[PDB]
């Protein structure tokens, strides 16, 4: 219903909504899109009482084979179903400390070590381990955060605005094309490029720049790329498939 909506402004008390994660060398975008929207939604649904960065390692390593092929792809509508069934622990927990199961796969943006080779290290899905990596209390099956239901959203512009405004950021997926890695500012719109492959991301609102109606999106590739982590893509036509793959769910308990 509004002309312009941004979740970072509507629910500022929730760090995770303004945060950009670095996905590294493996195709877990499907796991990040899901756990970041889920993270966002837990906060929104408890009025800020519970702020956690839901475990991407957990989604990836413990859903495991059932949600895809780990670092080689996977499925949004499956990550979300698994939150409902077995839930996910943490990898960031608010009041500082540190999460249960953080993301071990090294990043691709930053430089680190000594001379740029950032990623190029492990890049090999670790194992499921129903243990909090030590120092975090309490126990794994108690840090577990569950989902009530999960469902697809419709290929419709309004349902998507209405899912976002009423319940918080969501997950979607689209087709990347070389002209997209070039993104910095404005509303992206696909014109050329080699089909690089299928990526998954977090949609968290809307508006217009000049005349173009867009979706506010968080990419999972760190903060130098694009607009401090985020971009805007054409909203209205299902441009690159961004409306065709929308999935969400509602947090259990609150």
């Amino acid at each position: 219903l509004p002309a312009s909506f941004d979740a970072r402004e509507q629910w500022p008390q929730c760090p995770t909504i303004k945060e950009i994660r670095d996905q590294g060398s493996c195709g877990s975008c499907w796991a990040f899109g899901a756990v970041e929207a889920i993270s966002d939604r837990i906060c929104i649904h408890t009025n800020a009482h519970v702020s956690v960065e839901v475990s991407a390692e957990d989604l990836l390593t413990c859903c495991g084979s059932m949600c895809g092929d780990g670092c080689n792809g996977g499925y949004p509508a499956e990550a979300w179903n698994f939150w409902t069934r077995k839930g996910l622990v943490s990898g960031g927990l608010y009041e500082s400390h540190v999460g249960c199961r953080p993301y071990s796969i090294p990043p691709c943006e930053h430089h680190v070590n000594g001379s740029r080779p950032p990623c190029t290290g492990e890049g090999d899905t670790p194992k499921c381990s129903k243990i909090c990596e030590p120092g975090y209390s309490p126990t794994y099956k108690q840090d577990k955060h569950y989902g009530y239901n999960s469902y697809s959203v419709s290929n419709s512009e309004k349902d998507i605005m209405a899912e976002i405004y009423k319940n918080g950021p969501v997950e979607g997926a689209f087709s990347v094309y070389s002209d997209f890695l070039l993104y910095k500012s404005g509303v992206y719109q696909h014109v050329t490029g080699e089909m690089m492959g299928g990526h998954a991301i977090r949609i968290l609102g809307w508006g217009v720049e000049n005349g173009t109606p867009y979706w506010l999106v968080a990419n999972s590739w760190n903060t130098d790329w694009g607009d401090n982590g985020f971009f805007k893509i054409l909203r209205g036509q299902d441009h690159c498939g961004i409306e065709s793959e929308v999935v969400a769910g509602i947090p259990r308990t609150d």
Binding site: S25, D69, G73, C108, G197, G198, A200, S220
Partner: protein, 98 residues
Amino acid sequence: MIPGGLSEAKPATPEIQEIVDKVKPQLEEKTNETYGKLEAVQYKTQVVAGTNYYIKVRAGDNKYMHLKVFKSLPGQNEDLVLTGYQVDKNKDDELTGF
């Protein structure tokens, strides 16, 4: 539209060829071998926080070799790095996520 998988296969080009040569030195020291030329024929791309390339190169006889190269994002710079090879592979394998 597999949201993290590798693209279907594409006939190689000279870009995919500039890679195999740029990371030539890097594959060289890991197997300790010396090739006159790695010759790419097949490849897949994949979206990570960068693009990984799964290239199919030819070595000596009639058996091919597989190569995962991470390729930086315009922002950072144009990098490249062998992250994982797959020496002693068959003439006709599908390129497969590794």
